[PDB]
């Protein structure tokens, strides 16, 4: 268990030379992709991407398919509306992005909800934390906000985020408990790479962990070290787990002063690593 989330991501990209926007939708429980829809794919169905969702019946897949196609048409209409709001030509390609979802705490009760929309990579309109009000980034979005406040939109979203979203999240967590409620602590090790005859890189690896949230920090003689350090962005392994590393350049022979510290939900106490 622990705290958990369900999130849906949507991207629509207009194709002015010919045809409808490219539309891609993905659903996640925590950091696990479990459904997808791609307008360019052959099935034209919401498709499973985790074993525990495949047990849902045909009414589930028919319903999710209908709703995700309805999402795509909303985005198609929005792309046309926004072109007019911003007085842009019909010749350029533009993007709309949407994300919404809910978080639950350790007791699996509703913690927060969100629903955010972007146009051409910038905030457009977002539901506030109260699930009642709207943040509009500019005057175009202010027009949308006035429309949505008159049409009870935030009420419908709040009811979904606090009700349906949390209830189905709990169902998924149960059905997928074998993986969704398992934490994969990072498999850690340290490598050594000379950079001259008298300095070397120490690289501290965290491999095959889940969920993706992690902290790697270097210390020298028990104090935090950022000088001459490098930390890469957490990256997917391709099998559902994640990878990260942090590195520091040190004078050769002084490696024992340096310790790498790893914090992760799957670790009851943080790990400390030191070169041989």
């Amino acid at each position: 268990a622990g705290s958990h989330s369900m999130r849906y991501f949507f991207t629509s990209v207009s194709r002015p030379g010919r045809g409808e926007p490219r539309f891609i939708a993905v659903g996640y429980v925590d950091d696990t992709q479990f459904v997808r829809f791609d307008s360019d794919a052959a099935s034209q169905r919401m498709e499973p991407r985790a074993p525990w969702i495949e047990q849902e019946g045909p009414e589930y897949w028919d319903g999710e398919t209908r709703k995700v196609k309805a999402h795509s048409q909303t985005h198609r209409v929005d792309l046309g509306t926004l072109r007019g709001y911003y007085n842009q030509s019909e010749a350029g390609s533009h993007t709309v992005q949407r994300m919404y979802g809910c978080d639950v705490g350790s007791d699996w009760r509703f913690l927060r909800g969100y629903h955010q929309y972007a146009y051409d990579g910038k905030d457009y309109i977002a539901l506030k934390e109260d699930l009642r009000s709207w943040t509009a980034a500019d005057m175009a979005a202010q027009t949308t906000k006035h429309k949505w406040e008159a049409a009870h939109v935030a009420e419908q979203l709040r009811a979904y985020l606090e009700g349906t979203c949390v209830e189905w999240l709990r169902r998924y967590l149960e059905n997928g408990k074998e993986t969704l409620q398992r934490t994969d602590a990072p498999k850690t090790h340290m490598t050594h790479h000379a950079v001259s005859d008298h300095e070397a890189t120490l690289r501290c690896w965290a491999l095959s962990f889940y969920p993706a949230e992690i902290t790697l920090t270097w210390q020298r003689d028990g104090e935090d070290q950022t000088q001459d350090t490098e930390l890469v962005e957490t990256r997917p392994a391709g099998d559902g787990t994640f990878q990260k590393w942090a590195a520091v350049v040190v004078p050769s022979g002084q490696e024992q002063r340096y310790t790498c510290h790893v914090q992760h939900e799957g670790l009851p106490k943080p790990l400390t690593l030191r070169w041989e």
Binding site: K67, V68, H71, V77, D78, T81, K147, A151, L157
Partner: peptide, 9 residues
């Protein structure tokens, strides 16, 4: 599951 709303902007 997805929500069943998506009002237009």
């Amino acid at each position: 599951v997805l929500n069943d709303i998506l009002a237009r902007l």
